[PDB]
């Protein structure tokens, strides 16, 4: 009844440990996605600034 | 044995929770930073799209003058 409660508590900690590991696993997933998003956006923005610079020079004429 | 093992294993799993929480909090702090970065790049992307269209039109309105 001490041992019994302790064992039940140990099972509940194990379950909490599994749930925290799943949470960590989800955060790492989302982190890796945002790193990729951030690189995509930078490369997209670089392409746009290049097209703009090109247009700017065209229009520098008149 | 049994009762001392249980007590020890409990203290140990609670130790492990504390560490897993700190780890997840460290991931959240970096993620918050990446959400903020991405939001600024989205705002920039939108302004550049509008500027490109703006400029194309000026050019068209000068490719025809
Ligand atoms: Cl269970
Ligand atoms: Co990826
Ligand atoms: Co990646
Ligand atoms: Co925004």
Swiss-Prot record, chain A:
Residues 1-62 form a coiled coil. It is found in: Nucleus; Cytoplasm, Cytoskeleton, Microtubule organizing center, Spindle pole body. Transmembrane segments: none annotated. It comes from the Eukaryota. Component of the SPC110 complex containing at least CMD1, SPC29, SPC42 and SCP110. Belongs to the SPC42 family. Forms a polymeric layer at the periphery of the spindle pole body (SPB) central plaque which has an essential function during SPB duplication and may facilitate attachment of the SPB to the nuclear membrane. This is Spindle pole body component SPC42. It comes from Saccharomyces cerevisiae (strain ATCC 204508 / S288c). The lineage of its organism: Eukaryota, Fungi, Dikarya, Ascomycota, Saccharomycotina. The gene is SPC42. The chain holds residues 67 to 128 of 363 of the full protein.
